[PDB]
């Protein structure tokens, strides 16, 4: 039959042409970030490709809902992946949702297919049928916790799916994701979250310690503590009482040893508090440090992947500003499972720690988590940036332990062009160029990070310049609502080549554009993480942050237009 085959081939030819045009456009966009007319390609076919792009972008809502039908006729997986290749029309999503809701057994590819089914209705909260989610595969943890947030109404099947996906990971991931699990208890209408918490705590040990620290810290509201949380304080305290005591034996011995050691090292600052600032405080703290005894087998909670060996008895030093004090511990790193074996049975470096009393240490945790996620993304893709995730832990209301980078050289307490020249020689040597490269590597990453996270009120005291040449930002306390979007003075602009037409400026621009393009597609995880913490009533969360954060990612735009937008933002961020 002639006509049958004629249409049968023509339709698929058109679909393939459209898909190939989109792929070619995306690839050539990633090729060179800037327009760069000097770096061109074949001219003949590009005009035809662009004309076909306009022709297929000029169609209407009809004859566009049938391409989804044709794709589903070919194969369900292609239809599922169709909306990812962005087409500026919402009808594709609705049609795909209808098709998958008609029969969901065909697709069982875990990551993206469930999001077309899990929402029968976002807030309407009706029709509990055909929801046989028991067949699906586990997803990433952040997506699973969204079913306990303030977005979806409670439902048993989603809770079972969430506990199933959370019950299939090694302890390291949940140890990373701990601060959100406890906060998720606010919406625990059922008993699933609490029983999972007891099950996990009875399974391993370090996660139980992190538990006990977190519900000990977060039970109250203020740093000093004069009003408790009216919502979840009571059952929080009940859980704290219940979890401990049930364990016994060597676990009990380890718990007693570690907690007694931590209390004996914590009360030292309070003991030396009465002494005023001066040499007398130094002598008192040194005598206390000499008084400090160490029981072998303990560990530093900020780094649960190491075993402490000894201390430097003459290093006790408070900082200017409350008695926050510094210490130096020589430790050895072994691992995690080996640490568990050592704890139950009961190379080498030196680290500096800062103990602080009288301030909050939670927004820093959230920022550190986001930074670590960004670094992992960049490492996976295969780029060359640099950030440092210094560890920070909160152990009691107002009480925090901050890990410090050894050999710290703060820029402000240490003219940048003059120092660069006199320290690393003339422009024609090797160390100068290496320092410049490291400077650019750190600067691009941190500029992108600060633009994304909207951290304001920055000064010259929050910057630390290591010996290699990298730059490190600190004091992210004011964030998301508190206070020129990108800091750019003249000294680094001079150092980077003398002009914006210098080659290092082009390197900086291309690296920033590529980083933004790589980091764009994880807004869902970012939004889930920020929304789970939204409720805690920090001086930053005022309610409207979600919409602004979602808009700043540019979610409804193509690659070339996003690159144009980011380049325009960077250009306008110069004075």
């Amino acid at each position: 039959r002639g006509s049958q085959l004629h249409k049968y081939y023509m339709k698929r030819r058109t679909l393939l042409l459209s898909l190939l045009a989109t792929e070619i456009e995306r690839l050539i966009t990633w090729y060179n970030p800037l327009s760069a007319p000097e770096l061109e390609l074949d001219q003949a076919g590009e005009n035809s490709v662009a004309n076909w792009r306009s022709k297929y972008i000029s169609l209407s809502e009809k004859q566009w809902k049938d391409n989804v039908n044709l794709a589903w006729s070919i194969s369900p997986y292609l239809a599922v992946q169709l909306p990812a290749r962005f087409k500026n029309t919402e009808a594709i999503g609705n049609e795909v949702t209808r098709l998958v809701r008609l029969d969901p057994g065909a697709v069982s590819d875990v990551p993206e297919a469930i999001k077309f089914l899990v929402t029968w209705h976002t807030i309407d909260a009706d029709a509990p049928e055909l929801s046989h989610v028991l067949c699906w595969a586990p997803t990433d943890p952040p997506t699973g916790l969204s079913y306990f947030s303030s977005m979806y109404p409670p439902h048993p099947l989603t809770a079972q799916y969430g506990v199933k996906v959370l019950r299939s990971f090694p302890p390291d991931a949940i140890l990373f994701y701990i601060p959100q699990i406890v906060q998720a208890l606010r919406y625990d209408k059922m008993g699933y979250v609490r029983e999972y918490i007891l099950w996990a705590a009875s399974k391993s040990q370090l996660l139980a310690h992190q538990f006990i620290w977190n519900m000990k810290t977060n039970i109250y509201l203020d740093e000093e503590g004069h009003q408790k949380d009216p919502d979840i304080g009571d059952l929080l305290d009940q859980l704290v009482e219940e979890i401990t005591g049930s364990l016994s034996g060597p676990a009990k011995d380890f718990y007693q040893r570690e907690f007694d050691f931590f209390n004996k090292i914590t009360n030292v600052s309070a003991i030396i508090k009465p002494y005023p600032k001066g040499d007398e405080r130094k002598k008192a703290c040194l005598s206390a440090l000499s008084e400090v005894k160490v029981q072998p087998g303990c560990y530093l909670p900020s780094n649960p992947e190491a075993i402490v060996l000894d201390i430097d008895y003459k290093s006790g030093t408070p900082m200017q500003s409350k008695a926050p004090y510094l210490a130096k511990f020589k430790v050895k790193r072994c691992g995690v499972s080996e640490l568990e074996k050592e704890g139950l049975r009961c190379k080498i470096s030196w680290q500096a720690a800062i103990f602080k009393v009288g301030d909050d240490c939670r927004q820093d945790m959230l920022a550190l988590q986001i930074i670590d996620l960004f670094k992992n993304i960049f490492q996976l893709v295969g780029l060359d940036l640099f950030v440092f995730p210094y560890r920070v832990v909160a152990t009691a209301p107002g009480c925090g332990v901050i890990e410090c980078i050894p050999d710290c050289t703060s820029r402000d307490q240490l003219g940048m062009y003059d120092y660069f020249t006199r320290q690393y020689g003339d422009e024609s040597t090797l160390a100068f160029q290496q320092a410049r490269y490291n400077f650019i590597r750190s600067m691009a990453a941190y500029s992108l990070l600060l633009f994304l996270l909207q951290i304001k009120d920055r000064h010259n005291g929050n910057i630390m310049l290591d010996k290699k040449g990298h730059i490190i930002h600190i004091d992210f306390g004011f964030m998301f609502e508190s206070s020129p979007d990108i800091k750019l003075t003249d000294e680094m602009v001079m150092i980077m080549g003398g002009k914006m037409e210098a080659t290092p400026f082009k390197w900086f621009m291309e690296m920033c554009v590529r980083g933004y393009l790589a980091v764009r597609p994880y807004m869902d995880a970012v939004v889930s993480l920020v929304t789970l913490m939204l409720d805690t009533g920090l001086p930053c969360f005022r309610g409207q942050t979600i919409k602004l954060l979602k808009h700043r990612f540019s979610p409804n735009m193509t690659e070339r237009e996003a690159a144009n937008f980011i380049m325009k933002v960077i250009q306008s961020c110069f004075l």
């Binding site: 057994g105 046989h132 028991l134 059922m190 609490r194």
Partner: protein, 177 residues
Amino acid sequence: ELGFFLETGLQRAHVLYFKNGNLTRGVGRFRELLRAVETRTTQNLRMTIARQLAEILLRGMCEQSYWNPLEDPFCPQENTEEALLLLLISESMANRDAVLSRIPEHKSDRLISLQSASVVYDLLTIALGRRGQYEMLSECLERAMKFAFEEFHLWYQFALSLMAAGKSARAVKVLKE
């Protein structure tokens, strides 16, 4: 409001009926009691009497020893039809008193609810299996699947029903679990 001995006076009559062998008068009085229009105070009574009537009708006599409720030896014509109707109404207005597996501190009410669900679905299965109708049975267990969280019986029965109906992949997945 809520007395104490009126229900005793109502119930000991059928207790004596069915303990002295007066099966015909007992089932007739059960039927007439069911004929009363339900109010907000008789739902549990009609629960109990309907369950007992379904049991005794299913395991008490053959088909050739039954007649319509209006007559005397929607209008049902055979015993399993009225039993099915009774089971549907009972489960339909029972499904709204569930406990939905919270277990914060209490369990006993959850155990009683699980027992009632297990027995009602057991009667549904024994009623529908003999007549070779498996599609509606499979859909019934699929709807019922909400309660169970770590219970072997419902998973086993659902897998068996799915595998005996024609569908295979879902049966394979449930069998793996």
